[PDB]
Write a protein that binds this ligand. Sequence first.
Ligand SMILES: [Zn+2]
Ligand SMILES: [Zn+2]
Ligand SMILES: [Zn+2]
Lengths: 117, 185, 128, 104, 62, 59, 36, 67, 151
Amino acid sequence: PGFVGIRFCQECNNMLYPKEDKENRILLYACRNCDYQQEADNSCIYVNKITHEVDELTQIIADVSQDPTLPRTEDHPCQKCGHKEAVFFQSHSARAEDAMRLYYVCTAPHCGHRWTE
Amino acid sequence: PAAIADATKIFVNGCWVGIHKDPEQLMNTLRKLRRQMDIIVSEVSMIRDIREREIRIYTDAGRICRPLLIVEKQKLLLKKRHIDQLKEREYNNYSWQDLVASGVVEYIDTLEEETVMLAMTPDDLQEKEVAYCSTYTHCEIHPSMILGVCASIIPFPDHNQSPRNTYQSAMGKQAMGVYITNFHV
Amino acid sequence: KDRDSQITAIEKTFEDAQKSISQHYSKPRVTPVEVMPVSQAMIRGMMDEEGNQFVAYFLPVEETLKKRKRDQEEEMDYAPDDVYDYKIAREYNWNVKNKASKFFIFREGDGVYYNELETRVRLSKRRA
Amino acid sequence: GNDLYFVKLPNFLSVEPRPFDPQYYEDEFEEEGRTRLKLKVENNARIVKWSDGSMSLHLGNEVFDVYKAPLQGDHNHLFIRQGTGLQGQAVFKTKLTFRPHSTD
Amino acid sequence: LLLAALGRRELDDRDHYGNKRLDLAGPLLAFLFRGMFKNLLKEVRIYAQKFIDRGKDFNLEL
Amino acid sequence: AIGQRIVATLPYIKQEVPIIIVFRALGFVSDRDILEHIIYDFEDPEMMEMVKPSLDEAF
Amino acid sequence: MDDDVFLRCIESNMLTDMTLQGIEQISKVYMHLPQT
Amino acid sequence: MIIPVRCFTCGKIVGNKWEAYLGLLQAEYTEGDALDALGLKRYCCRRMLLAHVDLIEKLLNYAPLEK
Amino acid sequence: AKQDVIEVIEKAHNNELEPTPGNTLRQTFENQVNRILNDARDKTGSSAQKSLSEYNNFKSMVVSGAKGSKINISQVIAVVGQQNVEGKRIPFGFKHRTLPHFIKDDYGPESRGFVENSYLAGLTPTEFFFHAMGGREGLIDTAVKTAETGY
Ligand SMILES: [Zn+2]
Ligand SMILES: [Zn+2]
Ligand SMILES: [Zn+2]
């Protein structure tokens, strides 16, 4: 499914709101400030992930490998670069109950690969 | 604004003043500057939050901080020559400020302690059968300095129940003695 | 104030530094051992790159690629900003172009004589 | 002969880069004026080596104990650049590194 | 605020001393001095106004 | 009403004020400009949908 | 109101007030054997 | 402020030992050997000499009330 | 006990730990760790208690009921044990740390406030601070309950 992003008008740079064209029976995205209209390409207007199945690997950034206060391990080598050392840490993010899961990051500079066991 | 995504914000005394592209070597430069008593004075706090890309610098008053021994790769910067010059403190006028100016000691505030990895003693910097950290950045001068004036009079306070140490810290203040030398006047 | 006192006071140090010394200033308990009597242009070096302007840093007695550091100018608009390099030949060696990095005073044991040769302008070079 | 004789004196102790000669000296300077004349009268030098290892400055009746700090941040190649050869005939003496800080 | 509401940042701790400041003798006396100097300048304004309204000079010392 | 609205309790004002109103009062009228100032990563729809109620409340 | 807004509103309502099973005001229930 | 006359515990005279104790200490005695030289064998009298703080020497840094 | 807690930590880190009914995974991990450490404290206290002679004066005062308890003997001889703030282990007052001396995300016993020393052995600096935190909790309780109870 995936989320749906906001899209803005091409004239007033205000957000385009959803609207339906009965004549063609087709979804349109129209600005309620100017008189711009656009043919939608997703057909989906709203998405709620109640389960919150978020891949926290996307929230991690490689720069965290520079943190002296994070633990490092030599037991989980990097699959992308083969570096031995890697920092690991827990989710520590709200809305995540099973947050004892460990996320690893490669400490090699300019690799910054992140993964999970 | 499109640049702010990957860039690191820089706050100075709470004001977002700009952004930067390599926060790591910026922090290295600023720490070198503060340890050399260059434009950055010793009491300036410089916190790099890494997960959120802020770098917060503080120069304002009221920030409680404490001195700590900086740590190299896994070694103290306080070599034996500093202790030697400190032993003859009364002849060669080698003082605490020379220790701070040498880049051997650093004042760390409460907010910069969050980004610091402390060694309780230099024994923690020894390579162990299983290394706990191996990437320390500072060391305690002595852990007993966590106590104040009245708790620093308790002998063996780590063998008492803590309420007892609190009650003594309160009762050292009602103890009789000589409150001041010039009490006759 | 006056010059007839300045002439004698400036000569006074030139004379007193040559007397007998046997005592400290704060606690006269330390005995002296020896004495070290006293334009210029110093090329600074970056500690990471580690620059070898001389053969000392290269751990060499003399130049294995030269015999005279003919410090010549980089151009006409750069007298203090010359180009110091240890190359007696027109060879493409390490071209260390000493940029203008504009007290750091220098002296030497000039046969136990009274002089000075303070530096003019701290230049620093890189690998060009 | 070739030993490091580098010293870094502060502003109120700036000694003359040339020997004191009566044809190069003149009267121009005068609590306010007391620190002013001391720039060109007390500021030739004899760096005494003691037995404890430390040095001291001797430019008259007052002694300034100095400390030969050895710095690995300014490793500049100090050299007598006299205008004679091509462009400042730098003579190879001693690389400046250790800076001695004089003070009252 | 959105990072906190999305769970991407932790709520800030009121008790963290990194979030606190110790108002010492200097900054406290400065608060007093600002208030008191403002009151003094006010009193000077009234005193000088009641004189220049008469179209004549006044002594700031008084 | 529908979603979570962001407000701003400014000083010397005894009523909550939508953040979008404050941004427009500072000279940023286009919604794109306001979210450029608020959301720095446009690849993140979560932030976007959570700010959307405030825009919908100030049109 | 338009249809899509009405769907969003009833979505936000159904997800909160639509009682599929159980008794209102009872958040959680734990079943156990009392040892005492 | 001044060396007590007697030991609080036994009542041995320690008042005449403070000056001798200091003279022994500047003679490069250890505090224990100094206390042994003065004949303080019970740890109460050793407590008296070893824990004494001569504050009177600091009170004599102030000029008296009358000249 | 510390190896047992390390094993539970390793299980949780590898997602080899499943929650028990009525608790979240964090709470189940905390329950397991606290059970291990309470078992350690009780076993060590029993060891100290059995070591006592009939001439021991702590045992004399505890036996007569005049003063003290077996837990006091255990804390003086064996181990002081877990320090709790608001009924939980020492909180992460720093960012994912209890003190700057620990690594981030360290749920081990010493990191979170288990005093593995006795009062005769003496507490380490971190044990000293955590014990001061736990004792501050008791002082606050004693000083705050009085007004409500008197009312
Ligand atoms: Zn539009
Ligand atoms: Zn990698
Ligand atoms: Zn006695």
